[PDB]
A paper describes a structure:
Here, we present two crystal structures of GH73 enzymes from [name], including glucosaminidase B (SagB) and the glucosaminidase part of major bifunctional autolysin (AtlA-gl). SagB crystallized with two and AtlA-gl with one molecule per asymmetric unit. In contrast to the crystal structure of AtlE and related N-acetylglucosaminidases, which were all observed in the closed form, these two proteins crystallized in the open form. Hence, for AtlA-gl and SagB to cleave a single glycan strand, both of their domains have to slide together into a closed conformation as observed in the AtlE structure.
SagB crystallized in the P6122 space group with two molecules per asymmetric unit. The structure of SagB is well-resolved based on electron density maps along the entire chain with the exception of the N36 to A41 region in both molecules, as indicated by the Ramachandran outliers and higher atomic B-values, as well as a few other side chains. The crystal structure also contains eight PEG molecules (PG4), two chloride ions and one sodium ion. The two molecules superimpose with a root-mean-square-deviation (RMSD) of 0.46 Å over all Cα atoms. The catalytic residue E121 is positioned at the C-terminus of helix α10. The R-domain comprises residues from A1 to D71 and S187 to K250, whereas the L-domain comprises residues from L72 to S186. The failure of molecular replacement was the first indication that the SagB structure must differ from the AtlE structure in spite of their high sequence similarity. Moreover, the angle of rotation of the SagB structure superimposed on the AtlE R-domain with the SagB structure superimposed onto the AtlE L-domain is 31° with a 3.5 Å screw translational component. Thus, the packing of the R-domains and L-domains in the SagB structure differs from their packing in the AtlE structure. The equivalent helix in the AtlE structure is distorted after the fourth turn with the aromatic residue Y201 slightly exposed. The α15 helix in SagB is almost a whole turn shorter and shares the same minor widening in the last turn of the helix at position F185.
Residue numbers in the entry: 1 to 250
Write the structure that this text describes.
Amino acid sequence: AFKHVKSDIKIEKLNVTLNDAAKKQINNYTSQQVSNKKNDAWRDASATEIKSAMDSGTFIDNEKQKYQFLDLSKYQGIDKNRIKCMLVDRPTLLKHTDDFLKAAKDKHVNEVYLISHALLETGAVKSELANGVEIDGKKYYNFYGVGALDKDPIKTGAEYAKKHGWDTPEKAISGGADFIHKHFLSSTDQNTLYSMRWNPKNPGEHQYATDIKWAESNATIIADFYKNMKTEGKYFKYFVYKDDSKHLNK
Ligand SMILES: [Cl-]
Ligand code: NA
């Protein structure tokens, strides 16, 4: 059955209106893009679209879009049997459920986000990184496509694994999680898809994507996974602009 979870929400109230945040956004970055109607056709995002994409006010109140605020650096403790639901069509990952969860706990990564990286990264040809690739005798594994260049995934992914001593699937799963934390969660101000994307606390500093819908799409995906498991997230950090009445106090 559906399992409700006691939410732990932090409300980051920003000392700027959404309007002023958009104004800072257009003046601090370049090449903000958005998809066309028929996808795989990027174009320039207008200011109105940028501002809409920045609207934490609409996202907070949305069932799926609130996941733009899920805290990706926090291990939740989701029942491992529920997690196996995400790994139905992925035997090799399914079997490592326990390893993914221990790595999520030890390296500080939300388990759904961690597995979604493994799921969406061992697909098609890349699955061979998860099964192991041989090299000069030993063998090496890569569960998140770390360092796997799109031109030559296996050689690069495997050589990266080799370079990092990932000679066991457990070492790759653990090491790979430490990589995800170090790379995507290295800043305390960018532990959510929303803050990763707009860096509202450090105007002008690194944003993780130029596609204005990057957080939206990735939140839909995480939300769907939780829904597929019949449960929900626990830790969230909402970003709220100073002109958002409906949430500035709450
Ligand atoms: Cl954050
Ligand atoms: Na600009």
